[PDB]
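task queued by scheduler; priority normal; single chain, no ligands, no partner chains; default sampling; output format set to structure tokens
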Amino acid sequence: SPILGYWKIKGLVQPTRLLLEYLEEKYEEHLYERDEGDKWRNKKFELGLEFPNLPYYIDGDVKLTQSMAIIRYIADKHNMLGGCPKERAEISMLEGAVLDIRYGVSRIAYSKDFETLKVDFLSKLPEMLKMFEDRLCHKTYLNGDHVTHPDFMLYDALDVVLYMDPMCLDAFPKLVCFKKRIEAIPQIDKYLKSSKYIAWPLQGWQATFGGGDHPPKSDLVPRGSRRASVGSRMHYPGAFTYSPTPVTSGIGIGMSAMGS
């Protein structure tokens, strides 16, 4: 029996949590919360662990660690890494291209001036989110018709990003389909819906972003609300508060100029 260890947070072990789920895998995690920081420390080394750390994993003869060596290992056991050095290069490139955003936040997330480094991260994100959108043209998952580990990596990355700016995906309807498609997976459909699911925090309870015991909206910040309007409150079952509008006023119609 494998025992995945980590904190009771999304962190680095979330996507491996989504792969185990998706592969109907048997495992029992060793969750650690803020309180028991002393728990993991009087145990850390009594694990016969080569390179002590979190997330960890024990398959019996395999006392392994390192955040991403596990997810790949698990992805190895089932022939998911790659068949040839050619495509094994793709998965690692999708992997790494995902880690640029996953890590993008997890460097700026615990900083003092996250609020400022926040604007500059979202500035490169819409350029990164095109590399993944573009790649989905005629593709269920990043690598086509089958699922790969960097899929729960993109899902996780996409999930998190949607907390910084819940608008940074609109221009990307193919990435939103992608997310909605992973969630539409039974094994992933009955995990995000179980107790196992760890919906918070995003990083660590000590993270300026994705931190805390609760996920309220509280802070965050808009901008385009300092100008005119494009809202409407007519049959728009929203959720946030970005009042939509109508497509035109009926049909094409052209011409026109407006007035004020």
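post-processing summary
- The longest helix spans residues 88-108.
- Residues 2 and 179 are 28 Å apart (CA to CA).
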